[PDB]
Structures are given as structure tokens and as C-alpha cells.
């Protein structure tokens, strides 16, 4: 459990939580990000 | 250096599949069920093709999306780690740590 491995787990857990929290909004965010580029 | 080169040529759709791979099947299924078929086709294709990407490239992708969610208010916790990533990018590892120590106090 290096500092790097633990920091990785910090952001992964919050990103997972955000996706679970509002899946329809993140799905559209992803569409909009793709269309932007 | 090769990883860096490979990271900067990922399309946004490739980055999204790499993010989805790392969050796991259950959470990925939740996103895919709210996408249109053409979006699901493209993202599903990259999940199959980018399975087993280097973990360091995946971590760099997560950090990129972490900053997006912080700046748009989807994530309102973990400010310390966000600061740590920001200061490391802007000041480098060793001056960022001296800021970080003062920042935690």
C-alpha cells in the first residue's frame, strides 16, 4: 500500500461514487466530452 | 516516455473506456444503460480493445477525470488530494509537499 497505490484508491473510489450517484448525467457528460473533441 | 506518448494520443472515447474498465463491470453497466446504441458500440469496442492497459496510464486518466469532476462540482470531497495533484503539476513533487504540509495545517 504505497502512497501512490493509496492515492489511486482515493480518486477511484470518488469517481466510482460519482458514476453510481448520477449515471444518466455522467453518461451524457461522456457523450458531450466525446462530441467536444 | 512511451506511456506519456501513448497517453496523449488517446481519444476522449478511449479515455472513457479506460475509466470504465477501472470502475468495474457493475458501475460500467449503469453508465451503458443510459447511453445510446452508437455510443455504447464505440465505448464497448474500446473496453474490449484497451483491457489490460498499463495501470499508470489508467491512473493518469483517472486524475484527468478527477479534475473534471472537481471543477464541475460532481465531486465535492477529497480537496486535499486534488490540491496535491494540482501543486505537483504546477510546482513539482518537492515544493508541492512543503505547500501540502502547510495546507493540511
Swiss-Prot record, chain B:
Disulfide bond residue pairs: none
Signal sequence coordinates: none
Superkingdom as given in the UniProt entry: Bacteria
Disrupted gene: phenotype observed: Nonflagellate. Forms dense colonies without swarming in contrast to the wild-type which forms diffuse colonies with large, swarming halos. Expression of flagellins FlaA and FlaB and the hook protein FlgE greatly reduced.
UniProt-annotated location(s): Cell inner membrane; Bacterial flagellum basal body
Function according to Swiss-Prot or TrEMBL: One of the proteins that forms a switch complex that is proposed to be located at the base of the basal body. This complex interacts with chemotaxis proteins (such as CheY) in addition to contacting components of the motor that determine the direction of flagellar rotation. Required for flagellum synthesis and motility. In H.pylori four flagellar switch proteins are encoded, FliG, FliM, FliN and FliY.
Family designation: Belongs to the FliG family.
Protein name (record): Flagellar motor switch protein FliG
Organism of origin: Helicobacter pylori (strain ATCC 700392 / 26695)
Residue span relative to the full protein: 7 to 111 of 343
Amino acid at each position: 500500500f504505497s502512497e501512490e497505490e493509496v492515492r489511486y484508491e482515493i480518486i477511484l473510489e470518488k469517481i466510482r461514487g460519482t458514476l453510481k450517484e448520477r449515471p444518466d448525467e455522467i453518461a451524457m457528460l461522456f457523450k458531450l466530452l466525446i462530441k467536444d473533441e | 516516455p512511451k506511456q506519456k506518448a501513448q497517453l496523449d494520443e488517446l481519444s476522449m472515447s478511449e479515455k472513457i473506456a479506460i475509466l470504465l474498465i477501472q470502475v468495474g463491470e457493475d458501475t460500467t453497466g449503469e453508465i451503458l444503460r443510459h447511453l445510446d446504441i452508437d455510443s455504447i458500440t464505440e465505448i464497448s469496442k474500446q473496453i474490449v480493445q484497451l483491457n489490460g492497459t498499463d495501470k499508470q496510464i489508467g491512473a493518469a486518466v483517472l486524475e484527468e477525470f478527477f479534475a473534471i469532476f472537481q471543477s464541475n462540482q460532481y465531486i465535492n470531497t477529497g480537496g486535499l488530494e486534488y490540491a496535491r495533484e494540482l501543486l505537483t503539476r504546477t510546482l513539482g513533487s518537492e515544493e508541492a509537499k512543503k505547500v501540502m504540509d502547510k495546507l493540511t495545517k
